[PDB]
Amino acid sequence: LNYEYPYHPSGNPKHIDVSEIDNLTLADYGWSPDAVKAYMFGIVVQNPDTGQPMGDEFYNHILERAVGKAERALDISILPDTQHEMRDYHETEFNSYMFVHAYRKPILQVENLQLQFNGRPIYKYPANWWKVEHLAGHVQLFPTAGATFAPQMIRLEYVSGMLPRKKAGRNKPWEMPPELEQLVIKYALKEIYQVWGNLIIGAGIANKTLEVDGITETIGTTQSAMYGGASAQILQINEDIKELLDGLRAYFGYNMIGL
Amino acid sequence: LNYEYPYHPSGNPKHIDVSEIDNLTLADYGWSPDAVKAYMFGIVVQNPDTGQPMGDEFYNHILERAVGKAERALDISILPDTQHEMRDYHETEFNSYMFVHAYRKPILQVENLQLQFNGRPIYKYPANWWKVEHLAGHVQLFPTAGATFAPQMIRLEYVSGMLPRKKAGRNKPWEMPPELEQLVIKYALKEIYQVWGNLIIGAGIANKTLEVDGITETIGTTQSAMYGGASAQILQINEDIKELLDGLRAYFGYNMIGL
Amino acid sequence: LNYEYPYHPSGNPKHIDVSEIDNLTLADYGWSPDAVKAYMFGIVVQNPDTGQPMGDEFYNHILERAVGKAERALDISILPDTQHEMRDYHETEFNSYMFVHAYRKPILQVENLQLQFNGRPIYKYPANWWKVEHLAGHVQLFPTAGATFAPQMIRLEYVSGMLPRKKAGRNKPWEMPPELEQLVIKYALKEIYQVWGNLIIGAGIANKTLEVDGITETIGTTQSAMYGGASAQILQINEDIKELLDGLRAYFGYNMIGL
Amino acid sequence: SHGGTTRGILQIRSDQQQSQHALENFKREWKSSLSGINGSWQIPVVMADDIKFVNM
Amino acid sequence: SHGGTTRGILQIRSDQQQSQHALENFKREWKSSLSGINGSWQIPVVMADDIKFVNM
Ligand SMILES: [Zn+2]
Ligand SMILES: [Zn+2]
Ligand SMILES: [Zn+2]
């Protein structure tokens, strides 16, 4: 077999170039102001006195925080990033084919794996030994050929993250599921509805009547002393979030550790 | 290896200069009056009789207290600060590679570590022995080469805190998660909504009608004898806080100690 | 080492001069009428018949009692004061490096520590032996070199209290947390809202209508036979208090004693 | 030779599961305080919402 | 040599924990009435909202 050294085509196939991780952007995953606005078709958000529409800056801000919330809501790494870990030796798992669980998952690829002492490599494992399970976040060695623990013996460098899916409706284990995109959308949408729900009427108005010279107008509104103007949509979005998180917490597993 | 002495590049890499910790400010983390106002787009807070808008002083005041509340809500150190601890010897943990848990986390870097007697250094551990786990708040030694406890034997100097994140959507373990910023925002916003909710109408008005010379006006409002004018927004913000704190209390672990 | 005698720089560093404890005032901690008024921006409290505004005397009165309530709500000493204790000998804790828990915490500094008999010093411990843990309220000795209890053998003089914090957003263990200030504010604010909630309308009015010569006015109000005019704000302030006390009762620990 | 000798499962439960990083440094807090002869008589204090041990 | 021999925890519970001063003079009330041979057969009366002893 011949390959770019670390990327042995069975155990550690290359999925991204370490230059592309700088080139990828939120819009490449479909997280864009236009995508949010699409879910608010027929609505426009604008300053009631000034008339100017809300700018895309706030949309992108909200989207970046929605991605952060999604990355803590599921114990995952979404946008590609280079991770450098110093990991403890434990005898049970070191005996178990040098088992290590990465802090961040999925693994896009492993970049380096060494056993070291004060930064000196004691051994560098051949890349043909590296066994990677991308969605699990597991790395192992299968060698071709006085204490139960010690700190920071293992040095592991890898890329965590997901790539945008290459086919409609489908994703590989290292590609983003189609509806995690929609989950991040829904999180953005829930904040934008909170903004819009202030502006449908003047501040604090929950009923109005005006009568002048035999003309009468009277409006009841979705605002009230209990419920804000976008309560309903937020409730629905919360339902959708609940279903989405149920499904995605079935796709990613339960966390476990042996003590 | 060559390095600035304490900052051995494997065990204690330098993340901040001890001059920059004075230069960092709240606005560098995005906590600014403009950031709060953005979440109240289309609202303005102004004195009903005087017309003057509420000044940025109150915004910055509220933000500083929102940071304090966030630092107690999660057992964390947010803004960089230099911590000096005198720590007890305990035989079990001293035998466990000189294990010490810092009072404040994350560790940005360790500055000094000594075993002492009446302020006299008995031993100064080489910086190449220091093993730091930044997000955990753990420090250990891995030496290169009549009682179970005694008070204040170990002197530990370090910087605790978080740095502002360098990439969109991503944070290293020593960088602030994108939505802890939003949590501090939400805490500020919850007080500013309490202020604004007094001023939408005259004091104590919950309904009004005026009729003069065949013109009639009638307003119902979000105030009531139970609910204040911004009850709804505060409730929603409390929901968002609950979700954010759930996620962040999953990111930081459960506290534990052995007795 | 050279130092002002009691203030050995490792075990008992000096944090305040015993002259400054007289010079510190509530306004130095930010507890001021202006600080309360800021949280009631756009409101003014004034005698409905006399028109005169409520004086700062009542504000300072309320603030002093809010500090007293805060000092019992958390088992702490807030404003610096000199504490003189006569403490019992107990064999277990005297054997445990002369362990004593102070009645008041934090310790700013220890001023004197002696073993005595009818006021005669039997031994005065060298200040280089004193080990102080400020936030815990613990003092111990680490000597450099017929009954299980007896009354009032140990004489301990110290300063308890907190200093105003020196940096924004941050506090040392002997400095006041930024939101304990806000807790004392909220306690003051809760009484001032009870005062203001009487004056928004005439006494006992919960609805009014007046019609004269074809002009009609009609007002519904936040007063009712159940809820007072500021019920809502008081409820919200109670919520904020609950969150603040949760956080601060996590910062200070659970009380314990061995019998 | 082949069995599961595992005594039981320590169930800790809260509003959400810990991250893997949190759980691995909790494993370090555990082993540095409680393992072997060195830890043998210490007891951990834990303040989780509920703690259960299932005997298998 | 190293263990916790502690029999158990006496949990007393009320609307709020006692101050440290209150708790230390409760320790004095306790030891002056109940410790050693001198106290050996007396029983304390306590009127806390609930009292529990946890066997460890
Ligand atoms: Zn896993
Ligand atoms: Zn910890
Ligand atoms: Zn205590």
Helix axes B178-196, A56-73, angle to 10 degrees: 120
Separation between Cα atoms, residue B236 and residue B216, nearest integer Å: 35
A138-145 CB contacts, 8 Å cutoff, 24+ apart: A138/A99, A138/A100, A138/A101, A138/A102, A139/A99, A139/A100, A139/A102, A139/A107, A139/A110, A139/A113, A140/A96, A140/A97, A140/A98, A140/A99, A140/A100, A141/A97, A141/A98, A141/A113, A142/A97
Strands B138-141 and B100-101: antiparallel
Half-sphere exposure of residue C35: CA atoms within 13 angstroms, side-chain side: 21
Q: Is the CB of residue D28 less than 8 Å away from at least one CB of chain A?
A: yes
Secondary structure element (H or E) that encloses residue A11, with its range: none
- Cβ partners under 8 Å of residue C254, min gap 6: E17
Q: Would you call E21 an interface residue with chain B, using a CB distance cutoff of 8 Å?
A: no
- Taking the CB of residue A17, how many other CB atoms lie within 10 A of it? 12
Mutating which of A149, A153, A154, A156 best tests the D interface, going by the most D Cβ atoms within 10 A?
A: A149
Nearest CA in chain D to E56: D43
Q: What's the rounded Cα separation, in Å, for the pair C128 and C1?
A: 10
Going from the Cα of A137 to the center of ligand 1, the distance in angstroms, rounded, reads 7
User: How do beta strands B107-117 and B120-124 pair?
Assistant: antiparallel
Which ligand has an atom closest to residue A104 CA? 1
Q: What is the number of the ligand closest to the CA of B102?
A: 2
User: With an 8 Å Cβ cutoff, is A103 touching chain D?
Assistant: yes
Q: How far is the CA of E30 from the centre of ligand 3 (A)?
A: 19
Eight-class DSSP state of A32: -
**Cα of B228 from ligand 1 centre, angstroms:** 46
Distance from CA of C252 to the nearest CA of E (A): 12
- Cα B59 from Cα B69, distance rounded (Å): 15
Interchain contact, C255 vs E17, CB within 8 Å: yes
> Using the beta-carbon criterion (under 8 Å), do C259 and E19 form an inter-chain contact?
no
Tell me the chain E residues in contact with residue C102 when contact means C-beta distances shorter than 8 Å: 20
Contact B123, B114 (CB under 8 A): yes
Beta strands in C16-148 (DSSP E): 81-90, 100-101, 107-117, 120-124, 130-133, 138-141
Run of H or E residues at C183: helix C178-196
Q: Which of C230, C116, C150 is nearest to B203 (CA)?
A: C230
- Between strands B149-160 and E50-55, the pairing is unpaired
Cβ atoms within 10 Å, residue C232: 26
Reported as type and span, the H/E element at residue C248 is helix C231-251
Closest CA–CA distance from residue E20 to any residue of chain C (Å): 6
Q: Which residue of A has its CA nearest to D34?
A: A259
Q: In what order do the strands lie in the sheet with B130-133?
A: B100-101, B138-141, B130-133
Which H, E and C letters describe B168-182, residue by residue?
A: CCCCCCCECCHHHHH
Judged by CB atoms closer than 8 Å, whether chains meet at D27 and A257 is answered as yes
**Contacts of E among chains (3+ CB pairs under 8 A):** B, C, D
Task: Take residue C18 and report the two structure tokens written for it.
Answer: 């015993």
Chain D partners within 8 Å of A90 (Cβ): 31
How near does any CA of chain B get to the CA of A134, in Å? 19
Question: Residue E21 C-alpha to ligand 3 middle, in angstroms?
Answer: 10
CA distance A231 to chain B (A): 9
- Asked if B47 lies within 8 A of C43 by C-beta distance, the reply is no
| Chain C partners within 8 Å of B79 (Cβ) | 167-170
In the complex, which subunits touch D with 3 or more CB pairs below 8 angstroms?
A: A, B, E
C-E interface: how many C-beta pairs under 8 angstroms? 36
| Contact call for D36 and A254, based on CB within 8 A | no
How many Å lie between the alpha carbon of B184 and the closest alpha carbon of chain E? 30
Cβ neighbors of E37 (< 8 A, separation 6 or more) are none
Resolution in A: 3.1
Cα torsion B162, B167, B170, B171 to 10°: value is -20
Phi, psi of B129 (to 5 degrees): -85, -20
Whether the Cβ atoms of residue D11 and residue B225 lie closer than 8 Å to each other:
no
Q: Do B194 and C218 touch (CB under 8 A)?
A: no
B172 within 8 A of A103, measured Cβ to Cβ: no
Is D29 assigned a ligand-binding role in the annotation? yes
Q: Does any CB of chain C come closer than 8 Å to the CB of residue E26?
A: yes
Q: Which residue carries 């409820």 as its tokens?
A: C235
- Residue B255: list chain D partners with CB under 8 A: 47
User: Which residues in chain A (133-192) have CB-CB distances under 8 A to chain D?
Assistant: 137, 148-149
Which among A4, A15, A8 has a CA at the least distance from the CA of A142? A8
Instruction: Tell me, yes or no, whether chains A and E touch by having 3 or more C-beta pairs under 8 A.
Output: no
Binary contact (D20, A103; C-beta < 8 A): yes
Q: Can you give the length of chain C in residues? A: 259
Residue in chain C closest to E12 (alpha carbons) equals: C256
Task: Say yes or no: B91 contacts chain E, CB-CB below 8 A.
Answer: yes
β-sheet bridge partners, residue A121: A116
Residue C255 in contact with partner chain E when CB distance is under 8 A: yes
* Residue A6 contacts residue A127 (beta carbons within 8 Å): yes
| HEC-encoded secondary structure of B118-163 | CCEEEEECCHHHEEEECCCCEEEECCCCCCCEEEEEEEEEEEECCE
Alpha-carbon distances, residue C130 vs A252, C59, C106, C142 (angstroms): 54, 42, 16, 7
Probe site for chain E from C77, C103, C138, C160 (most E CB atoms < 10 A): C103
With beta carbons under 8 A apart, name residues in chain D contacting B97. 32
Copy the structure tokens of residue A124: 């560098």
| Unique residue bearing structure tokens 């929950």 | A206
DSSP run (H or E) holding A141 = strand A138-141
Could you identify the residue written with the tokens 């100690």?
Answer: B257
Method: cryo-EM
List the helix and strand counts (H, then E) for chain C: 6, 9
Question: Ligand 3 mean position to C83 CA, how many Å?
Answer: 17
Burial string for A141-177 (b: 16+ CB within 10 Å, else e) reads beeeeeeebbbbbbbbebbbbbbebeeeeebeebbbb
The contacts of residue C51 (CB under 8 Å, 6+ apart) are none
Structure tokens at C80: 């610096």
Closest CA to A190 of A52, A73, A50, A76: A73
For the record, the structure tokens of B28 come out as: 């560098």
User: How far is A195 from A58, CA to CA, in rounded Å?
Assistant: 11
Using CA atoms, how far apart are residues D43 and D37, in angstroms rounded to an integer? 13
Residue A165 · residue A129 · CB < 8 Å: no
SS3 (DSSP) at A94 = helix
Closest CA to C133 of C2, C258, C253: C253
3-state secondary structure of A19: coil
